């Protein structure tokens, strides 16, 4: 019943957790919006390089090709 796009839409204005393949860094932040190509836009971004945080980014954007999954 619950589609992927729909889920994504729902998740806007809420916490999100994306992880990439090349250089695995868990990006943690509040999701802003998304397009047809599945591009990400985060707020209060924290680049957790395998648990440990590099630094508090703030507002940020993320490409579609790099990311693996999306979760709470």
């Amino acid at each position: 019943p619950v589609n992927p796009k729909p889920f994504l839409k729902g998740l806007v204005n809420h916490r999100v957790g994306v992880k990439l393949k090349f250089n695995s860094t868990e990006y943690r932040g509040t999701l802003v919006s998304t397009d047809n190509y599945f591009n990400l836009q985060l707020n209060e971004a924290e680049e957790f390089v395998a648990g440990v945080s590099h630094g508090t980014l703030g507002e940020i954007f993320i490409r579609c090709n790099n990311v693996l999954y999306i979760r709470e």
Partner: protein
């Protein structure tokens, strides 16, 4: 015969168990159940769990996996 387009529909109908495989990491494999239907390979997977298989319980919610990243799926 069973096609890929109808397969998704079937999966949606059923909500059966699955064991997703990754591209980069061979050991770390996802486990859950598919839900969402779409044109592309990307679909929603409820109750995700990344288990470290042999050549063990990763914390994650309802994983909406990417289309290109998915290596396998059972149903």
């Amino acid at each position: 015969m069973v096609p890929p387009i109808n397969c998704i529909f079937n999966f949606l109908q059923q909500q059966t168990p699955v064991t997703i495989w990754l591209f980069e990491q061979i050991g770390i494999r996802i486990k859950g159940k598919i839900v969402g239907f779409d044109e592309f390979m990307n679909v929603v997977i409820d109750e995700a769990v990344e288990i470290p298989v042999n050549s063990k319980g990763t914390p994650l919610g309802k994983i909406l996996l990417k289309g290109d990243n998915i290596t396998l799926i059972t149903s």
